[PDB]
Design a protein around this ligand. Structure first.
Ligand SMILES: Nc1ncnc2c1ncn2[C@@H]1O[C@@H]2COP(=O)(O)O[C@H]3[C@@H](O)[C@H](n4ccc(=O)[nH]c4=O)O[C@@H]3COP(=O)(O)O[C@H]2[C@H]1O
Ligand SMILES: Nc1ncnc2c1ncn2[C@@H]1O[C@@H]2COP(=O)(O)O[C@H]3[C@@H](O)[C@H](n4ccc(=O)[nH]c4=O)O[C@@H]3COP(=O)(O)O[C@H]2[C@H]1O
Lengths: 312, 312
């Protein structure tokens, strides 16, 4: 049904997807409406998609040409099960199962658009960004291999490996370098700035010719310690994890606005008074998470006129 | 003794100081040597100083015209006592005592150079940066008040209030807005990028005419859970706090390098195999912390030739 076709212009259209546990049902609600407004799969209209943690799941599926409805079905099938886990080993196994089943043996040579999948290096404590094409590399292009030769499953699993509650994910690059990786949300749970870095620096696009759409997971009432103590034994570490991720997400958006006022950007992550959920790490109740789909469609509707102007 | 005088050029010299508990003895070791190499108090040569958490203590004293030896004496007198606290209430009281005793009733109208003191808004989860002069504001300059009318004590206490282990610090701005603030290290424990944002965007300085010096606290062997379990009851939250702060520090440096390759910058935060310490929150043993002073002087000596070229 997504038969609408678009001409080519010199405008770089960038999509940046936040991480947020199983609450990306909100993200998919926003994306569904953007898809139906365009009349084409998202990879045809967007030049670059960045994602972090469970947002990298969506970003990778978009880059492989999936339609949002297909993404929603896979996301429903696998993401809540990961978050329902209540042991580190169960969480890591659930996540490994998701990665292989969803992405199989696809690689970063298989993508149909620019991509960036953000993880965090345990050793250097700096990001490792799996990319698809050398033209968005900022250096060392003689040794560039798409995705470091790593499969999309391993890159997405790394992006999601929120140690200490998941195991760290060990990777060996095509150049023969072994790296231990953890969740990308520690350095850029909101990956918009990173995506902009590719567009401005690596793709040499002028700020006038960039359109950025950054979709989050939405903002909901924070779980209080009384609830957290009943479901998590390390409740304070669980709360600290959530609060720090939120700060990283919001402060990253403020920094983008400070440094890149002249880059047209729409961020979609509205505040709601329901549902009352656990943290991103722990929430898996599909009855609550499915209502985030509607909330995402509501957030699109509040911005549809400007989104039409961005994406044409 | 600091009698050397320097002419005026159009080069913006920027100093950016990481947070790191009581381990800023390392920072002061680096700064002592920079001071003695210059022959003047740091505020005469530097145009802008940014600091976060215990690094904002040093940055504020530099901005008030203190000499590094004076800063070291105050830092020794008050910072380790804060970190020796083993209850939230004891920590918050120790920190309040430090703020008032060290800075008394000085305000952001009392500074002798540009300053930025970074804290984190609990509500918006975005930075609140206390500044001294409207010319480094990026907007809303009609309502600008130096430091929001807040005293340096309250701004530095806010920058250091690492909730959940300190209480959040309540502030009322000169415009009559009340804000709850926590440690700046949650959004920019390394404040170099923020400082660069002021120099490039707000001060309209060309990248060629900026010199950035970013001093950290150094990198040391990480405490393992066996040790942490013996000194902290919420040891996993304590470890997560340290690891996330480190990632914020190092990833912030990587992002600066990606976005601002053409801004001359020196970062000084070397790796050492001793001393073995607790996390930044918990370490207070002066016998260990005092050896960081020597390590900071060693780190300066490895970069003295290039530091001479930066600062003349
Ligand atoms: N848009 C951005 N926003 C914020 N930070 C960014 C961004 N881009 C890079 N970085 C950081 O800068 C460091 C060096 O980047 P370089 O581009 O200069 O060199 C690249 C490239 O040549 C090659 N390579 C990259 C991707 C791939 O799929 N295959 C592959 O071969 O490896 C190096 C990447 O390694 P890391 O990713 O581990 O480290 C990066 C990252 O920490
Ligand atoms: N260099 C930077 N790097 C990264 N982020 C930055 C930087 N600078 C600002 N921001 C962020 O951008 C938001 C809006 O900044 P604006 O400069 O546009 O307006 C300012 C100013 O007009 C006025 N004001 C500022 C300081 C002072 O001592 N008295 C005073 O009156 O208040 C607003 C500040 O409030 P916050 O600090 O709470 O929010 C900031 C911050 O989140």
């Amino acid at each position: 049904s997504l038969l609408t076709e678009y001409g080519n212009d010199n405008i770089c259209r960038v999509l940046a997807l936040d991480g947020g546990g199983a609450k990306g049902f909100y993200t998919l609600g926003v994306l569904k409406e953007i898809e139906a407004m365009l009349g084409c799969p998202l990879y045809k209209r967007f030049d670059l998609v960045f994602g972090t943690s469970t947002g990298a799941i969506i970003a990778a599926l978009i880059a492989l040409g999936y339609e949002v409805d297909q993404i929603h079905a896979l996301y429903t099938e696998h993401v809540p099960r990961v978050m329902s886990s209540r042991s580190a080993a169960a969480r890591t196994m659930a996540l490994q199962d998701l990665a292989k089943e969803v992405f199989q043996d696809k690689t970063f040579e298989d993508v149909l658009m620019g991509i960036g999948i953000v993880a965090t290096r345990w050793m250097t404590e700096r990001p490792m960004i799996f990319k698809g094409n050398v033209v968005q590399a900022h250096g060392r292009k003689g040794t560039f291999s798409p995705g470091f030769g790593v499969s999309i499953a391993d890159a997405v699993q790394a992006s999601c490996s929120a140690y200490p509650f998941f195991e760290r994910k060990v990777i060996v690059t095509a150049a023969g370098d072994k790296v231990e990786l953890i969740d990308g949300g520690y350095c850029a749970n909101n990956p918009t700035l990173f995506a902009i870095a590719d567009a401005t620096v690596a793709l040499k696009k002028d700020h006038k010719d960039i359109r950025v759409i950054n979709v989050g997971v939405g903002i909901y009432p924070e779980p209080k310690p009384g609830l957290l103590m009943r479901i998590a034994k390390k409740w304070l570490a669980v709360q600290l994890l959530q609060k720090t991720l939120e700060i990283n997400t919001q402060s990253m958006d403020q920094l983008r606005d400070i440094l890149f006022k002249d880059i047209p950007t729409i961020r979609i992550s509205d505040t709601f008074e329901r549902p009352e959920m656990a943290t991103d790490l722990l929430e898996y109740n599909l009855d609550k998470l499915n209502t985030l789909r509607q909330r995402g469609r509501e957030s699109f509707g509040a911005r549809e006129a400007q989104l039409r102007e961005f994406l044409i």
